[PDB]
Design a protein around this ligand. Sequence first.
Ligand SMILES: [Zn+2]
Lengths: 88, 189, 48, 51, 48, 101, 284, 286, 94, 70, 68
Amino acid sequence: AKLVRDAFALAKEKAPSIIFIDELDAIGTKRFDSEKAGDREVQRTMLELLNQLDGFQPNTQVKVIAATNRVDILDPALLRSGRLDRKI
Amino acid sequence: MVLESTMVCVDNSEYMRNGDFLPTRLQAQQDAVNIVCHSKTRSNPENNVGLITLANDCEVLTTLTPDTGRILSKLHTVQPKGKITFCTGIRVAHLALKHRQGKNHKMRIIAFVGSPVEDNEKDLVKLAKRLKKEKVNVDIINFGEEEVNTEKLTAFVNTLNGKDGTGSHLVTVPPGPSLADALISSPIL
Amino acid sequence: CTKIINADSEDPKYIINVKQFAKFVVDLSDQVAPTDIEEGMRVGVDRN
Amino acid sequence: LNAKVRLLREELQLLQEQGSYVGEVVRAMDKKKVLVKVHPEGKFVVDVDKN
Amino acid sequence: SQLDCNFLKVVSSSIVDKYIGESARLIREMFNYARDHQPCIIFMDEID
Amino acid sequence: KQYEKSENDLKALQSVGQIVGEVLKQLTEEKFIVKATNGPRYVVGCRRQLDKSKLKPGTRVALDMTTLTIMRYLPREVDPLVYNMSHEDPGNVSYSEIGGL
Amino acid sequence: AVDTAEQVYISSLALLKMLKHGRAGVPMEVMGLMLGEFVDDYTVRVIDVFAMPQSGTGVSVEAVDPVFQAKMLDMLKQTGRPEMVVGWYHSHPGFGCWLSGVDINTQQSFEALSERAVAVVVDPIQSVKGKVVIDAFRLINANMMVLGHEPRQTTSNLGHLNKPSIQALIHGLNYSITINYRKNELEQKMLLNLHKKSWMEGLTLQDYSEHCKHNESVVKEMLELAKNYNKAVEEEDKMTPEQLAIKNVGKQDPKRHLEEHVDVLMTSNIVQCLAAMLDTVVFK
Amino acid sequence: AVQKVVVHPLVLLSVVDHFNRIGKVGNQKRVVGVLLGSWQKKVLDVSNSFAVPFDEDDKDDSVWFLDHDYLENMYGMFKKVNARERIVGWYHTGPKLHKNDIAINELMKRYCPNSVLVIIDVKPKDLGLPTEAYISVEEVHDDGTPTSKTFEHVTSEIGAEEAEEVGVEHLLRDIKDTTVGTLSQRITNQVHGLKGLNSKLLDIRSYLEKVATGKLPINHQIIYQLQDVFNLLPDVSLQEFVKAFYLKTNDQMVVVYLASLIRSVVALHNLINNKIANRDAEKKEG
Amino acid sequence: TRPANHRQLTFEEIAKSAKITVNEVELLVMKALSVGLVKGSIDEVDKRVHMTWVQPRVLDLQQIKGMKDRLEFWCTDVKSMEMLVEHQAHDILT
Amino acid sequence: EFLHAQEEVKRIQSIPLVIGQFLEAVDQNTAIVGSTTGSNYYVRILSTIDRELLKPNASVALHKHSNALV
Amino acid sequence: LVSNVIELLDVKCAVIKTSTRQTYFLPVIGLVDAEKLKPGDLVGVNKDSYLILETLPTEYDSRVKAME
Ligand SMILES: [Zn+2]
């Protein structure tokens, strides 16, 4: 959580830059969960990243692009509307 | 050097608003102050000072202290409104002096008797009959209003002495609005 | 043992992350000159 | 009634002494030394009482 | 446009669980949510 | 003004703080089982004045650090999480931006 | 030059102030200097104690800041007495009643200032309900090596009851100065049921509708106790009486459910009648 | 405007210590100081106290000295030691509230807007008056009275604070007047309550005698405008009670028949078993 | 003026002391209650009325003698009952 | 004395307490109990407590400085 | 003990987490101020009292620092 919070941080700082989240297939996986939830922290991290992406208006200029070798497993939320939307 | 403390009875009476020595009278009680005792600490820096009002049965505005800022600050707000009180006023100062530290310090009450008093004839029994056995010293300052020479007040020092006493003196500076040099030079103290 | 995530320049205060316990703000003991202590190196923080 | 003032009194003193810990022993070392394993913490080389 | 104005309730997927208890809990949570305001209408799309 | 801002500054340098925990049940009229965010559970009650209000089997109370009697209410936190499915926007939409339907 | 079984007398107000100051700041640690009189070679008495604002890294030699130490002891004599500083509050919230190396370093200077001063340790957390963990300590002399076993002596007199505690053994130990609380008769006249007596509330009849419900609630289960008593009275028919009558569990009836109930019913139903009839004639 | 005032047991010990300390060097028979508390609501929990030099002149009982400088200095040090205490009034002994009461209240009102003075004695226990609380409200008058000092009374009760209740528990640990010995204690409570009612009624009688003899002014306004009404409901229902006091029989049924029967049967069984055991033992011994 | 025991008075008394009609008496008592000078109750079939007070008035020295006497009798009775309880219960009081 | 003693024993089951689990039982007056901490302890058991409600597992309180089944 | 503020209430209040995962409410905000604050900002706290001493300058852990 701290890693991601900071990562989207220091982006407003040094305002001009673009972030590339490689191997996005791992940090975010389809919304499977454990009844114990002890090993569900990665879901918290992914939700934090999603929140950061949501809290972003085109007035600010820090772009984000990422690659996923298997688009199949990516959580069908990181593609909703205003988070990663353009596909190449 | 100084074998004495200091307490003052700064008048507050309703009559205190008058042009008789300067601006509005009391403006002069304040006058010595800045010397009313400024001179007293012009002595070894171990003297003690005080303050006591005398209207509306009189309160106390300063507890014996080798400081002067407090006494000046309280003096700034001494609005005169009320009938003067005595006897009781002097006994309050006497008790306060008894609660003095550094027993080596002797006692001294400088009475700024301004507006007229209502004291009866034989007030001496309580006014002075004690200071001997209590080895106290009282000074009287007559802010004008010297009605028929105020022999009533003069009798206080009269009861004083008996052989030696009077403190410095019961100096009644003339109603001439000269100044406080009369309370600055006149007081050899 | 503990790492240092910052060393306030011209301000003797340091910030350290011990390992699993928590973070903290630490003062540098007189026995060690500040120059000998840098950002990222492992410091020997004491108890108490 | 003196019995009651003891069967119920001594119980209080012997109810205010710090409890015990539960552990699993492993490989009793040389006599007068053992290796227990506490639940949250690690293995301690505890002693052995006289009883 | 009607006097509801409260439409949104983005889809409905979180009510999926492995026992009826968690679904009952989530549905009463949302029902109370709807009871919070004027007539609330719950979008139910996004199902597979 | 500086002295004023300093007096309260030093005065507040006495408070000790509570522990944030969520009540679970209602044992008695003066015994409520309370948990803590860290995880350990305890048994405590109101202090001497709390309205003893609803305090349903879920709510935020800041227990004391010595006696642990419940001290104060506290609304839900809703930390950024699955806890924020609420987007009721009442009335800012019309057929003015329809797709022809 | 040698200690003994010596008694330290702390005043009732002193104890109360110790406990209040300790609990006010339980999460932290507090410090408070003690004033008292050095009665005699085996009697150190403290009449009252005063607290020192919680400053510094904790209990240390900083609590003796002269600016604050002088001015209180001063003004205090103006009204009352000068009882010379004799000891210190100190306080260990959850650490038993031990003294640590820093505490020893502190008390070393106080010992230097005095010759027999004492260090108190009042536990504000463990001591609750009906427990007082106030234990008094002194610094064993640096000449430990070989000497008469401890400076305790204990040869002068046998006062030694309340032998050493548990934790102090684990931590630094071997003094444990014995402590005896003085209580003036007046000081306990108040602080008595003056704290809770009743005032005039004995002549209250108790909610009558409530009484007639409590009585039924109790008698109805007295019936069940009676059924159980019958059942247990058919028992003891020479099968294994000696062993069985003692091995039968279940709160044997006429000891916890048929005797206590009768005793409570009697008291309630009699006090109610007495109050009722007393008021029937007190008021006309 | 206070509904009640609660005193922490530390303050009473404070006053007692003050009286002892002075009177061991004093003969004025009056210790007076200013206390501190927390005016949290209508209730005011005075939780600590200090001392202040005070000398009074027996002549006219109107020359004295309270060292307000001592007031500020003491309060400053106590504030450094703890910031949660606010000066809320003063305290003094000598149930004879002396003349310089309103005067001192005026002097001390320059440190509080609603100062309340609670008087603490150092002696009586027969009745339950350990302290009483007074307030200085100068409401001019009603009806046709002139103005005056007009001190007023606030109800008071001695309270407690955890970590100090423990202190008092230990400090006493001998009388322990709790529910211990409940039946005996209840009877003693009924006796004590009757004695207290006797004492209160006697006080009323003395005041009535003094007012009727003309020594003191008739306080028609409030003193007896309530005594008359109190005299007006000394319950006199003595016609239907003859049948409304069969609830006494309802209690008596239980409290006599059931309890006596149970205890009698239990005692019989206990005697039976004890005698059987001892007889068998003696027979088998030889 | 009634001696606090037979407070139940009859409409004849109210009429003879109030020169008002027998019929009007009930209305007069109802008005008194409504204004709030007494807090008794009104009944008819028994031809009586029940009072109970919360509005006391001023008095004079002679009227204080009755109050003093009532208090003295009450104090004597209370002392007697206290002494009876103390003496009889002396076995179990301590 | 006995009445005071009964009051004192009763005064042990009040105040703040810490919840634990009755893992298993040993000789009377003693048992082993879990904990909200998760560091299963060894405890002494108050005699006045019941015996038919001590299920193989259950929610029980413990003294903070004693961890005793109260 | 570094920490952050999470749910400023003002009922003038605070809700502090710590590096020890200890969610504790605060009676009064730190000796700092009610404006120099925001939902999340490294501010130090005392070892036991848990007040809010001087705030801190945002500093990034090496793991994220070594990514430009
Ligand atoms: Zn220590």
